[PDB]
Amino acid sequence: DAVVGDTIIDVSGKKMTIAEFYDSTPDVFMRRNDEARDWVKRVGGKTSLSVNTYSGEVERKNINYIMKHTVKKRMFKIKAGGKEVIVTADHSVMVKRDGKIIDVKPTEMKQTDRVVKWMLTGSHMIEFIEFEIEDLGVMEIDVYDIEVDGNHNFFGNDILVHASVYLNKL
């Protein structure tokens, strides 16, 4: 589960696509299987924006890992505030539901849910906004994820999505 490679992310305050960020990251592999088309790289010295789901505050946190997998999966577009993010069906988007920020699959969203969108104006850095969903069908596609320390979410095209955690198990 992940987002598409053209998704724009914050890397230490600069903007780039997540695929560009993956390609720019040195080949320090935590996991590599070319046949399964599955890669995890360690990241050093980079941060991104996230939301603390307990305090509700935006926090800048270290990026620990970046992942790339080529998948054949059902894809959904989340549209909110003139921005959009394309995610796999198995990947969680963050929503404000009943006063709490939680992770939900694109197939399980409610009409009363709101997505969390980055803001360029006003005293608040985020807004909770109505949204639409579009089913893009099944695609064979490179998808990417980052592990964000502590908060396990990140903004893709200004929309908050759940991050993966790679547990460095062994």
Numbering used by the authors: 0 to 120, 120A, 120B, 120C, 121 to 166
Paper text:
To this end, we also solved the crystal structure of an AesN-AesC fusion at 1.38 Å resolution to confirm that selected residues indeed formed β-sheet structures and to choose sterically fitting substitutions. Interestingly, two of the three strongest APRs within AesN (APR1 & APR3) are directly in contact with AesC. The structure also confirmed the presence of the recently discovered motif NX histidine as a unique residue conserved in cysteine-less inteins. We then designed mutations within the predicted regions of the C-terminal half of AesN. Amino acids were changed to ones with a lower propensity for forming β-sheets. Mutations towards polar and in particular positively charged side chains were preferred to avoid counteracting the electrostatically driven association with the AesC precursor. In the following, we focused on the mutant 1P(T69K/F75H/M118N), from now on termed CLm intein (cysteine-less monomeric; 15P), as it retained the best ultra-fast splicing activity with t½ = 16.3 s, only about 3.3-fold slower than the WT, and reached 89% splicing efficiency.
